[PDB]
């Protein structure tokens, strides 16, 4: 069942005495005319404790998991044995409970409804326990939740909170809050400003136009021998590395110094496409720092290589029945390169 | 009652740095509660225990807020916290999903997931244990030796801890300077009819000044009124006529 929290839920925010003044403060409070939850003791569920509860009824236990692992806080004489602390101490008995920045607040009022009542802090406890649920320990009561609302307080000559204003409920309350009084006169008053927010983002670019001619490089009919390896300049074009990356037709795709799948966004001065053919088992020798006949006399990568290496089998194009004798490789030399 | 002079003039502390409150004056002022946090870390990393510093410690282990009000003490302990065979009883967290909020402690030891494949709670490739050992030794360099650190956090309500300064007696209807739990000022101490609630402590003016005080020793409500002041005027005829004056 739902009931409206008409005007109750205000409390003294500090221990500072002010009288016959109007004070504006921002803190956590129970918003006016809020739907409360109703439970009856005619035949104790789990109730979350996200920020605070205005529990008014006409023991207690506050746990987080409640599996005898992260032991909770018990109130009868207060014993909090997570032990970590202990303490010994018609009728509308309203109470307020909240926890903020390692500080536990308890408020009370015992009166024998649309009325005003202010609660003073009792048994405040600065421990710092993590609490997320709420269970009563033992007839109808009510449960509500509080929100970060800005309130305008009224103090009388004796320093008792007798009136309050919810500065975010309705435009009349907004005008009262901005005029710092509980009565206003005729006229138009400025209250706040509105700003329409952006909906979605838009990014645009021109068309792709010319592409880099990877097709003719990779797809050509003839490759030169290793010892006379070719070379090409490629520039002034947009290159899609993703298409060649996600082809799954490449036996070996190793990258050095630069991670794949992110090449798509890095602008470079130049590229180079060195191509040749070597023995299949020997492909592992082409690496930045290896040694061997091929790596020492035919193609040596520097220690600071920055790029990727591609290779695949082509046994069914470059092999002839009579034996291909058009591929050569150096075997002797005076010194490495 | 806390006496900080014995700490300060000890000369056995390598570092004694104070933010917000200066030493040599701690034992004068009163404040609500302290908090002493203690732990042991490597010698080099001491500079990370300070507001606004970033790194492994100040990100995954122990983070101080930006409005810190306290003091930091540290001193080398190379002859207590090291062992011949290497001390592996001191650990520190290395990987975490996101940084820490101030004064928040983490204790769990679940396996970090550093890659795409979920680890399902077993360690392996790209599934690292999140804790590592310092490995202190008596022969390590001074940059790699154990240091003990104690952080004091003050919170500047009825104060309960402060210095050993003695109290004196109160006077009435006399322009004097007072000291109530560190609150200083000048005024005349007159009786007040204000009805403070039992938990009510002070009274504040519009200009954020104290108007009434509740004595700590004997619970009684006094009234503060600023001492007399004003301007002076000199009434003078022309000097060409006389030199007599009358002040106002």
């Amino acid at each position, epitope marked *: 069942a739902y009931t409206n929290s008409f005007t109750r839920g205000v409390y003294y925010p500090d221990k500072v005495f002010r009288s016959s003044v109007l004070h504006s403060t921002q803190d956590l409070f129970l918003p006016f005319f809020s739907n409360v939850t109703w439970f009856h003791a005619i035949h104790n569920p789990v109730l979350p404790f996200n920020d605070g509860v205005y529990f008014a009824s006409t023991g207690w236990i506050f746990g987080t998991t409640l599996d005898s692992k992260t032991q909770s806080l018990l109130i009868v004489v207060i014993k909090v044995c997570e032990c970590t602390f202990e303490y010994v101490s018609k009728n509308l008995r309203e109470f307020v409970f909240k926890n903020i920045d390692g500080y536990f607040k308890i408020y009370s009022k015992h009166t024998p409804p649309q009325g005003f009542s202010a609660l003073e802090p009792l048994v405040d406890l600065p421990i710092g326990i993590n609490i997320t649920r709420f269970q009563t320990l033992l007839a109808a009561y009510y449960v509500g939740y509080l929100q970060p609302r800005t309130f305008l307080l009224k103090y009388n000559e004796n320093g008792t909170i007798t009136d309050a204003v919810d500065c975010a409920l309705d435009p009349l309350s907004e005008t009262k809050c901005t005029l710092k009084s509980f009565t206003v006169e005729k006229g138009i008053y400025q209250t706040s400003n509105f700003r329409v927010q952006p909906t979605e983002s838009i990014v645009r670019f021109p068309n792709i136009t010319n592409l880099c001619p990877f097709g003719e490089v990779f797809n050509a009919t003839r490759f030169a021998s290793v010892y006379a390896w070719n070379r090409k300049r490629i520039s002034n074009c947009v290159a899609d590395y993703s298409v060649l990356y996600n082809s799954a037709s490449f036996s070996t795709f190793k*990258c*050095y*110094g630069v*991670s794949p799948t992110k090449l798509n966004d890095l602008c470079f001065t130049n590229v180079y496409a060195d191509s040749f053919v070597i023995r299949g088992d020997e492909v592992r020798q082409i*690496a*930045p*720092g290896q040694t061997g006949k091929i790596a020492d006399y035919n193609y040596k990568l520097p*220690d600071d290589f920055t790029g990727c290496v591609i290779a695949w089998n082509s046994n069914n194009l470059d092999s002839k029945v009579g034996g291909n004798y058009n591929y050569l490789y150096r075997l002797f030399r005076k010194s490495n390169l | 009652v806390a006496d900080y002079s014995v700490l300060y003039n000890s000369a056995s502390f390598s570092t004694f740095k104070c933010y917000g409150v200066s030493p040599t004056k701690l034992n004068d002022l009163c404040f609500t509660n302290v908090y002493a946090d203690s732990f042991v870390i490597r010698g080099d990393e001491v500079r990370q225990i300070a507001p606004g510093q970033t790194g492994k410690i100040a990100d995954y282990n122990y983070k101080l807020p930006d409005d810190f009000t306290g003091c930091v003490i540290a001193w080398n302990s190379n002859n207590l916290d090291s062992k011949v*065979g*290497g001390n*592996y009883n001191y*650990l520190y967290r290395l990987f975490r999903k996101s940084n820490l909020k101030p004064f928040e402690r983490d204790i769990s030891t679940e396996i970090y997931q*550093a*890659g795409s494949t979920p680890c399902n709670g*077993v*360690e*392996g*490739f*790209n599934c*690292y*244990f999140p*804790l*590592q*050992s*310092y*490995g202190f*030794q008596p*022969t*390590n*360099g001074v940059g*790699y030796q154990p240091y003990r650190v104690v952080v004091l956090s003050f919170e500047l309500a009825p104060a309960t801890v402060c210095g050993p300064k003695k109290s004196t007696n109160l006077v009435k209807n006399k322009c004097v300077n007072f000291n109530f739990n560190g609150l200083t000022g000048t005024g005349v101490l007159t009786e007040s009819n204000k009805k403070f609630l039992p938990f009510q402590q002070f009274g504040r003016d519009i200009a954020d000044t104290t108007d009434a005080v509740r004595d700590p020793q004997t619970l009684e409500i006094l009234d503060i009124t600023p001492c007399s002041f004003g301007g002076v005027s000199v009434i003078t005829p022309g000097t060409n006529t006389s030199n007599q004056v009358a002040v106002l």
Partner: single-chain antibody, 230 residues
Framework: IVLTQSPGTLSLSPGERATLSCRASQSVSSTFLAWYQQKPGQAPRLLIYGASYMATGIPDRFSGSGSGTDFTLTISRLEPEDFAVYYCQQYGSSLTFGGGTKLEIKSQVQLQQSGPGLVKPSQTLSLTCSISGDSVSSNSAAWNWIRQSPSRGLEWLGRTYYRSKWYNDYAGTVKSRIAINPDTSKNQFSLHLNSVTPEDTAVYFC?????????????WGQGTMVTVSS
């Protein structure tokens, strides 16, 4: 990930400094670089883990630094007994060693190895590494197998360990024909290779790794050689 030993070979005299280098193929986010020193005829020894932290019973001459994709080890004052070889190892998404640098000048836990040293080709190879001073089913440890051949250097074969049940990993080259079995009853773990080839001739070690010590090979074994021949 591939580690490249940057300086090739150095020769110095007693007294002055020495500077090494190690370069990574790409970033090591785990940051578990280590440095080993091996005298001839002996098992390697650990020097540094985490790239900065000293090992057990190591003088202060040794200091390491680096991060990201480069690292370096420095010797402050040479001593004419430090003619040895120095390696460079990492851990993370893959476990790979380094080439190593030649340098020349001018104990509560023990592992014991046993098994045949000669095998008829195309047969089974079996070794055993006994443990004295610890329990093979420890929660915070793992047991590996490392072999060394001059043509291939130092290579990682496989490992086993136990958290709640038993878990195994193996290197890609050797997946199809390798298996490791522990024996808690007599506190030993063994290595089996069903089939052998001539190139497998090498020297094998058994090692221990502690997860809280930077995943560094703390304790090694005596090591034995296996030759594949007629």
């Amino acid at each position: 990930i591939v580690l490249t030993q940057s300086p090739g070979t150095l020769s110095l005299s007693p007294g002055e400094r020495a500077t090494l280098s190690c370069r990574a193929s790409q970033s090591v986010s785990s940051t578990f670089l280590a440095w080993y020193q091996q005298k001839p005829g002996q098992a390697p020894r650990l020097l540094i883990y985490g790239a900065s932290y000293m090992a057990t019973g190591i003088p202060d001459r040794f200091s390491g630094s680096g991060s990201g994709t480069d690292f370096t080890l420095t010797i402050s004052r040479l001593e004419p007994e430090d003619f040895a070889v120095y390696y460079c190892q990492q851990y993370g998404s893959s476990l790979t060693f380094g080439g190593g640098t030649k340098l020349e000048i001018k104990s509560q836990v023990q592992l014991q190895q046993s098994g045949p040293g000669l095998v008829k080709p195309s047969q089974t190879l079996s070794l055993t590494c006994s443990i004295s001073g610890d329990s093979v089913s420890s929660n915070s440890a793992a047991w590996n197998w490392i072999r060394q051949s001059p043509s291939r250097g130092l290579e990682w074969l496989g490992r086993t360990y136990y958290r709640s049940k038993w878990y195994n990993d193996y290197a890609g080259t050797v997946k199809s024909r390798i298996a490791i079995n522990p024996d808690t009853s007599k506190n030993q773990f063994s290595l089996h290779l069903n089939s052998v080839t001539p190139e497998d001739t090498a020297v094998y070690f058994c090692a221990r790794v502690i997860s809280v010590a930077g995943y560094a090979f703390d304790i090694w074994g005596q090591g034995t050689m296996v030759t594949v021949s007629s």
